[PDB]
Amino acid sequence: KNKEEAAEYAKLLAKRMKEAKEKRQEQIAK
Amino acid sequence: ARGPKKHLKRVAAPKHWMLDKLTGVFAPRPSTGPHKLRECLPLIIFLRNRLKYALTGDEVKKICMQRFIKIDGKVRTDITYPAGFMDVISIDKTGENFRLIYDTKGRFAVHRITPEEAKYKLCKVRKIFVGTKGIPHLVTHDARTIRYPDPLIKVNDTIQIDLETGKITDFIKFDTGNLCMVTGGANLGRIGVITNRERHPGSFDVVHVKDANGNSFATRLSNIFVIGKGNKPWISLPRGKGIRLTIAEERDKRLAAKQSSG
Amino acid sequence: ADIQTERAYQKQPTIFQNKKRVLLGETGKEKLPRYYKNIGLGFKTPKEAIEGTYIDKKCPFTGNVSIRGRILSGVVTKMKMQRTIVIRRDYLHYIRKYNRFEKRHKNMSVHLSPCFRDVQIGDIVTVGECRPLSKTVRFNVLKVTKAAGTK
């Protein structure tokens, strides 16, 4: 259970960190 | 007192239980559980007093020990178990499912739901923290500890929980324009859309909510439960649909009914 | 030393003063980094606390106390005992048989930090509630405003 739940948040953490960097990189120039 | 108390007097019981004066001296003291003593409906007052499946408190025990009642998917044989807001009660013998939802008068309603709707519930978010080895942890209004949630979920939000697995399937954030119900205070049982939230640091916030008919009221931020996104609720609603009628309107609506009869 | 007038060495617990860095650091200057916090309810930290050298643990900005509870205001009455002052609060109490009022007062002891210098006994002080600091002290000075005879 631990290694299946830890490996699914790591995939869902990557998406939420990636979508939160476009919001910053786009805003700096604009 | 030298320790904790184990009794409850009938006049000291929560008024929305609707207990009469002359049945006894005592009232069921709720067991310790996920919901507070003054904000819960024990199983005995629901099986005996509301549904009238039992006539005495001894008959409630006979129904319970046959393992017929499931509270959110688990069999509870305690007859003073503190069920509360948004819980799902399932009686498989008669094929009935109920959800504990306040009505406009501030009392828990007998709200029957479909077997499909009984597979999930909506839970407010009370606490978020980080535990050992950096694992995020939630704590809800149902005393549910759910780890590894989405990082977009914050305090005062609402999540949807699948009762079979206990995992989050979706969530709604707290923002203006979202539907909500009041779960305490003087507007208890009312449904409306959030319009404003005034912040008082070091004290309690205040949220303004407007009904569908145009009536506006305000509550403390701790008494707000986000139901749906926008105007559309995520759960089925009771008969009154959250609109509080005035006493004159209620009188006219009652008098019009008996004229229809004939 | 002025800073070291007590029997026990006075320091800010958060601050470590013995970082052996280089001989040049010894040659350059000996000024300790200072711990100051932002006691925040819209209040601002005085610059005499960020640039001072006093050691007192019951100060809000540079000590181990938390400000929560009630925010009150009063007039300084006495400055006699070490590092704490006595202020006066005046109010009107309503007697409803006569539909009238009467003047009443309360004397309240508060802690005064060294960051609030040049304060005389005539002026308005804002106080914030904290944990019990002594037998009869529960409040702490958060802002000082000069009296009517302001220079």
Binding site: - | - | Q4, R7, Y9, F16, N18, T136
Partner: protein, 205 residues
């Protein structure tokens, strides 16, 4: 018995109160553990909520940190010197928190000599031992001796610390409450705090 109530005192105005209830159990106090110097003796005390405390009655060793070097080791406490609270606690040799005590230095002298590859604490009498010289002058490879040589640039200690290493005992402050957790841990004195504490020891004599 010993109570820690607030209603046996006087009011702020100076008026005598009258108690309305008797002594309760959430108000009790216990006799002090005057932790002395000796082989370890610890007694467990059952406390509110069912938990436990450790009354240390004798202590001999403790965990102490050389903060500048970041070197924490077990060390045998030797003697009790100036106390900031009471100067009576030094004649009876009582260990409490924030007390000035003497500790051995050899665990620190070994780490310094094994890390910087320099002799510290050696007297000027040419004391050489084959084990010590194998610690000090053992031949390393090119890269290891390079990494040791680039390290000797900042391997310097103050003049007050190195004098203490001549007599084999350092001055330390116990930062733990030995009568509540049963152990005496702390830090070695340095810098201006050591300068301050070396004055008031001499001012008592």
């Amino acid at each position: 018995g010993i109570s820690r109530d607030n209603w046996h005192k006087r009011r702020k105005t100076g008026g005598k109160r009258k108690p309305y209830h008797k002594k309760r159990k959430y108000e009790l106090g216990r006799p002090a553990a005057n932790t002395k110097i000796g082989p370890r003796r610890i007694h467990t005390v059952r406390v509110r909520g069912g938990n436990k405390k450790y009354r240390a009655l004798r202590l001999d060793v403790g965990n102490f940190s050389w903060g500048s070097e970041c070197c924490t080791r077990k060390t045998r406490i030797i003697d009790v010197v100036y106390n900031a609270s009471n100067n009576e606690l030094v004649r009876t040799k009582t260990l409490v928190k924030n007390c000035i005590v003497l500790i051995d230095s050899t665990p620190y002298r070994q780490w310094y000599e094994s890390h910087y590859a320099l002799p510290l604490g050696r007297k000027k009498g040419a004391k050489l031992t084959p084990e010590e010289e194998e610690i000090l002058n053992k031949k390393r490879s090119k890269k290891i001796q390079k990494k040791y040589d680039e390290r000797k640039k900042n391997a310097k200690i103050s003049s007050l610390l190195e004098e203490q290493f001549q007599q084999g005992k350092l001055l330390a402050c116990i930062a733990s409450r030995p009568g509540q957790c049963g152990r005496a841990d702390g830090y070695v004195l340095e810098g201006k705090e050591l300068e301050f504490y070396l004055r008031k020891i001499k001012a008592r004599k």
